[PDB]
């Protein structure tokens, strides 16, 4: 039943008595459901150390991964180029998923095409799909560049992208001069960040490999910046802002911030902004190239070093205080530009915030996950805040990365109770937050289900989620945030300390029971 002036959606409609009774009858009649005592017994067991040991012995089963597949990253990379259509050679189901996944995170349109290979292409390969796909995409959507990646069907059947594109041009399906950079992006190798690396290196080679003769390192007096897989608009913006404030000439290579934030003014803009073809062509003439997220830009680094002859500096992601300082000092050395007064003051304002908030941050215990560079930067900043990052999970991390993080932990007493996990998923993390309970989780929206599980054990065992990472689907507009630089650190600090204080207020809100500590001033 509904009352017309206070209509109920699913919550709380289905708590009406008539719906409750109906659901009970369905269960009892037809579902042959395990008894509630058995459900409770098994739940309790899944919270134990014994279960955790079994869980960590998994070799074949993955549950609730914290990674995606290569072509997702290729698509994001491609979106950062001016008037560029991401194009994934292979199966169309994949592209429906890539688009929707980003649509949900950015709350924006996400343009990408498929060439719709079907079962028939297993005989004969996907060459004809490429020919008609390229022609059709160019005519219909009028991109200035089509950036080609692959789905796993195309990789398994072994389609030679290079040969197919060349034949497409040979036979007149698209002009010889029309840019069609490409990369193989197998979903069964690495993760989405690998697809970003592969795509970027493919685009870099396309515009530079054959025209190296006339290039002189440093002749354009700019620094190239390669951001990697990045899903906070504030992160492209802060890096550009800081470099502009410092008077540093730069080229941000893959810059989707305009196309992922078009205005709602009565028109749809399929393309906006982005790195220009001229910038990619001229990139070898830079002083150097800086990699913002080096742990997933290894292939790009080899190309930049080996072909462009840039001496790529060994810099961590610019997250937290020390690593932002290092990034600025290196950029100052390369460019000859001094660090300006505005950035010095911004730094000191972050430090002020640290001094103001340190007493609530001190000793706070976190579980966290994400991509390798993001995770290591968050770990570093947590240590700078006097926090303990006790469970550090990077599903798509590697051994070399883990060694690097273990070293960062060793440089601080706040690292003493911390462990780094690679290859492990969110069902593994769920165990850790039961057996070695932290104060909070820092992670993406998939963490909400862990918080749910912990509250079911009891309010005293609940681990609240602080949403930082990708994807975030259950809050609005968090993709506008910043995590890099002093601005990002200021944002993360504020989010952390206020998460702490929100929880403290919840715990002290009980009239005559815990409100003795419900302080006006904190």
């Amino acid at each position: 039943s509904q009352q017309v002036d206070k209509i109920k959606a699913s919550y709380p409609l289905f708590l009406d008595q008539d719906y409750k009774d109906m659901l009970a009858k369905k269960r009892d009649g037809f579902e042959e459901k395990y008894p509630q005592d058995k459900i409770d017994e098994v739940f309790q067991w899944t919270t134990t150390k014994e279960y955790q040991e079994l869980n960590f012995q998994r070799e074949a089963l993955t549950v609730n991964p914290a990674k995606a597949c290569q072509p997702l990253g290729a698509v994001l990379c491609a979106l950062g180029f001016e008037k560029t259509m991401p194009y994934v050679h292979g199966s169309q189901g994949c592209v429906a998923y890539f688009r929707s996944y980003f649509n949900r995170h950015f709350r924006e349109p996400v343009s990408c095409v498929s060439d719709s290979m079907t079962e028939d292409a297993a005989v004969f390969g996907g060459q004809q799909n490429m020919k008609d796909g390229l022609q059709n995409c160019k005519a219909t959507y009028k991109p200035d560049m089509i950036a080609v990646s692959t789905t796993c069907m195309a990789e398994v059947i072994g389609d030679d992208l290079n040969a197919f594109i060349n034949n497409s041009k040979k036979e007149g399906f698209i002009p010889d001069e029309f840019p069609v950079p490409f990369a193989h992006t197998p979903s069964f190798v690495g993760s989405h960040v690998t697809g970003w690396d592969n795509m970027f290196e493919g685009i870099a080679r396309y515009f530079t490999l054959k025209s190296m003769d006339d290039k002189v390192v440093g002749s354009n007096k700019k620094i190239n910046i390669v951001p990697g897989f990045e899903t906070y608009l504030g992160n492209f913006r802060v890096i550009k802002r800081m470099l502009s404030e410092m008077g540093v000439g730069y080229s941000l290579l893959s810059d989707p911030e305009e196309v992922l934030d078009t205005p709602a003014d009565g028109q749809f803009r399929m393309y906006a902004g982005g790195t220009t073809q001229e910038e990619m062509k001229d990139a070898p003439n830079a002083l150097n190239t800086v990699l913002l997220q080096p742990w997933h830009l290894e292939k790009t680094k080899k190309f930049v070093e080996g072909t462009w002859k840039h001496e790529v500096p060994k810099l961590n992601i610019p997250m937290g205080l020390d690593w932002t300082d290092e990034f600025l000092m290196k950029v100052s050395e390369i460019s000859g530009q001094p660090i300006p007064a505005s950035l010095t003051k911004e730094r000191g304002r972050l430090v002020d915030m640290m001094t103001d908030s340190h007493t609530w941050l001190h000793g706070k215990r976190f579980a966290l996950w994400g991509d390798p560079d993001f995770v290591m930067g968050l770990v570093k900043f947590l240590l700078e805040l006097g926090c303990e990052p006790v469970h550090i999970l990077c599903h798509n991390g590697n051994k070399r990365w883990k060694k690097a993080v273990d070293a960062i932990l060793a440089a601080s007493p706040y690292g003493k109770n911390a462990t780094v996990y690679i290859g492990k998923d969110l069902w593994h993390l769920r165990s850790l937050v039961f057996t070695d309970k932290p104060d909070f989780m820092i992670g993406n929206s998939y963490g909400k289900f862990i918080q749910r599980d912990t509250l079911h054990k009891g309010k005293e065992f609940e681990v609240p989620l602080i949403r930082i990472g990708f994807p975030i689907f259950d809050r609005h507009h968090l993709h506008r945030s910043t995590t890099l630089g002093y601005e990002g650190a200021m944002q993360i600090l504020t989010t952390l300390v206020n998460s702490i204080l929100e929880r403290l207020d919840e715990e002290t809100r009980g009239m005559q029971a815990t409100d003795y500590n419900h302080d006006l001033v904190r």
Partner: protein, 477 residues
């Protein structure tokens, strides 16, 4: 817009295409004529998508894992192959259920075999057998396992049927191999059919020789309701108030036992024809169970459906039917009284999957709205046959619409509201056109039944009439 204008709109839009695409797309666009009962005279459907044109379609794994199997709550569904497909589809579809997630129910979890290079090179059948044992250890209350094949499985020659039989025998467990690789078919559609045949072959016959079920004359199953935002629950309530007993829901909030009990019912009530007509025909052939199509969108269709369903039973059900209708009359009438004056005359364009593009038209009409264009991602001509009579004369029909076409048609038609999916939503909002998600219900619903109609009305109003839509133009431009 007249027929000639719509015809000339189609021609204008198709001028952008190369010849081969133009000739194909012309066949998938039509101006409705409700005189027609053979849509194979007016539109082609269920063909491959043209490369490079930005179809909105998904794949057979979406149709099998995402649509049919995924909602079954007390089974574990393995996304078998590399990591992408299971991750993008994890909890994307709001197929609601009651359970203890991670313990007795598993719907919003992503179980995967996370194929690596060695699995592609040497095959994943050993991994799959090991994965099954790990599932049994860690999720002991699961009531069965399905194996949802992703693209590489068939391409590399794995034998998931052998693994399923051998492991199922060893563990006395229902383990269902589903060959729903995304290379198969042309869309979500073949995934439905594949999934239906997998239910038939591996689950549905389990209780064929079991007579213990306490059957009654009033036993029915809801076939093809995936309980989006609780839609099946707000349908079930009505059927049971009418005196029927809903033995099963396929597959929203569905359990493996209720699927196995379905061959014991007296009547299969089919909501989504496209997705579950296959198994419905199978049940009539094998068990003699009749099936009938129904529609629970809006009061006019819901009343008609209740009456048609009740007419299959006896006087006691027909009498309860009129009692139900009388009960809810003041409720939907009050919804109409409040919202119809806010929506009267407004024009809507729809683009959805296989059912809703025709099924929701009556609900719009109950609010005085007009559906001026509609179309489907993956419908067959039997769906278009059912559509031409529901749509007005000279309205626009589009099969497997391209992104370009959809934008251009909207620019000319200037609907007041669009109802489509997540990949469409933000495009049309930037154009200043109110948009409602007609898959996910924009995180609202239910929309089925009398209780759903109130929410549907609220929702179309809150969006179509929202103050934000008067603000797109800067006052200085």
């Amino acid at each position: 817009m007249s027929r000639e204008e719509v015809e000339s709109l189609i021609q204008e839009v198709l001028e952008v295409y190369p010849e081969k695409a133009r000739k194909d797309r012309n066949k998938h666009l039509a101006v409705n004529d409700p005189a027609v009962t053979q849509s194979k005279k007016c539109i082609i459907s269920n063909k491959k998508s043209q490369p490079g044109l930005m179809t909105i379609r998904g794949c057979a794994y979406a149709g099998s894992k995402g649509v049919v199997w995924g909602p079954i709550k007390d089974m574990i569904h393995i996304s078998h192959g590399p990591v992408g497909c299971g991750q993008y589809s994890r909890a994307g579809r709001r197929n609601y259920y009651i359970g203890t997630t991670g313990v007795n129910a598993f719907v919003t979890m992503n179980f995967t075999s996370d194929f690596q290079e060695k699995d592609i090179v040497f095959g994943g059948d050993k991994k799959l057998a090991k994965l099954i044992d790990e599932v049994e250890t860690l999720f002991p209350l699961n009531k069965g396992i399905s194996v949802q094949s992703e693209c590489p499985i068939g391409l590399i020659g794995d034998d998931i049927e052998s693994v399923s039989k051998v492991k199922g025998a060893e563990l006395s467990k229902t383990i269902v191999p589903v060959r729903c690789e995304g290379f198969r078919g042309v869309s979500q559609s073949l995934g439905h059919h594949i999934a239906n045949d997998a239910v038939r072959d591996w689950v549905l016959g389990k209780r064929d020789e079991d007579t213990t079920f306490a059957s009654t004359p009033y036993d029915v199953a809801i076939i093809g309701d995936y309980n989006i935002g609780g839609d099946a629950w707000s349908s079930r309530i009505l059927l049971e108030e009418m005196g029927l007993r809903c033995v099963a829901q396929w597959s929203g909030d569905g359990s493996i036992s209720e699927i196995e009990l379905t061959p014991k019912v007296k009547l299969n009530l089919v909501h989504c024809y496209r997705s579950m007509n296959y198994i419905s025909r199978h049940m009539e052939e094998k068990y003699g169970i009749p099936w009938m199509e129904y529609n629970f969108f809006g009061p006019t269709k819901t009343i008609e459906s209740l009456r048609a369903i009740a007419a299959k039973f006896d006087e006691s059900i027909q009498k309860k039917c009129e009692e139900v209708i009388a009960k809810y009359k003041p409720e939907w009438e009050a919804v109409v009284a409040k919202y119809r004056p806010r929506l009267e005359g407004k024009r809507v364009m729809l683009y959805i999957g296989g059912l809703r593009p025709r099924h929701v038209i009556g609900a719009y009409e109950d609010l005085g709205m007009e559906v001026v264009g509609t179309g489907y991602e993956f419908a067959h001509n039997d769906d278009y046959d059912r559509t031409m009579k529901e749509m007005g004369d000279s309205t626009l029909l589009y099969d497997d619409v391209t992104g370009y076409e959809f934008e251009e048609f909207v620019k000319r038609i200037k609907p007041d509201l669009i109802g489509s999916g997540i990949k469409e939503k933000f495009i049309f909002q930037k154009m200043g056109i109110p948009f409602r998600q007609m898959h996910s219900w924009d995180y609202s619903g239910p929309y089925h039944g009398f209780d759903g109609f109130a929410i549907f009305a609220r929702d179309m109003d809150m969006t179509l009439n929202n103050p934000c839509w008067k603000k797109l133009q800067a006052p200085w431009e």
